[PDB]
Design a binder for this molecule. Sequence first.
Ligand SMILES: CCCCCCCCCCCCCCCC(=O)O
Length: 300
Amino acid sequence: AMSPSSHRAASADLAGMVRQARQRILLQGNVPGFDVARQIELLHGLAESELGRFLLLYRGLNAEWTHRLVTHQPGSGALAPLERVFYERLPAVLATRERHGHFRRALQRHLRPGCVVASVPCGWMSELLALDYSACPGVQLVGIDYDPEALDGATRLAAGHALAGQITLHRQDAWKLDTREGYDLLTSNGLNIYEPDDARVTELYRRFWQALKPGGALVTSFLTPPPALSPDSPWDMQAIDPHDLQLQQLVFTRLIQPRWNALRTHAQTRAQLEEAGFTDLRFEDDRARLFPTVIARKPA
Ligand SMILES: CCCCCCCCCCCCCCCC(=O)O
């Protein structure tokens, strides 16, 4: 488990996080569509869920939960009723599954025989292990992650895979990446959205650029700001169910309080990537434009 190391049992910290969320409900009262009692029911649904508990405690996703959430097939599995609504209806969850699809299409398009593909942070390597390698013999896969549990999980997920022997894993802080021209393709999801400082994200992109061979490509992603937050929000409100958005807003803002709130526009992301040395940017937007994918080229 992610915790201890807080030196306490996770159950003790969880009770605290639940108490704090309950107080925020009681002190702030009703919201449109969800009275106090209903909010308390939502909090209980979170606390009864394995993923819900992880989010209450840690306020972000790790390798395990990114994989399990992103690869969830709607209607499948053993989920409690409310838990299933969270897995299947929240606009941001729908968006990250769309994004996952765009990552797969982009990586597949750019794959060539013998190429070296890196994922940073690799997590369980869900996207790379899902690709079709039938016409790309000799691909080498590289996974970098700072979480030893992520690397263990990648190994376990790849154990029966055709490319199990083509994987090299490294425990490294992604923010300190210093590979020089080692990869043809690099994919990254779930780092920039946790870093509110724009310059720190630009520097991460620069390390990605430095790690790519000339002519290589980066596939990454970013969460975008909603209309309340930015005059330049790309959100298509006609592509978002109003009630499910209200549900997400209550769950995120009041209950979980997620750490993935470094939201950036297409133009901001373009500026960062161009500063880092990338050209020929292509954006692959999800339907509501909550979580675009970007493919960025390093000049030959
Ligand atoms: C079942 C408990 C509630 C589940 C709530 C899941 C909300 C996840 C939102 C995922 C998309 C945006 C955040 C991505 C963050 C990341 O990739 O690390």
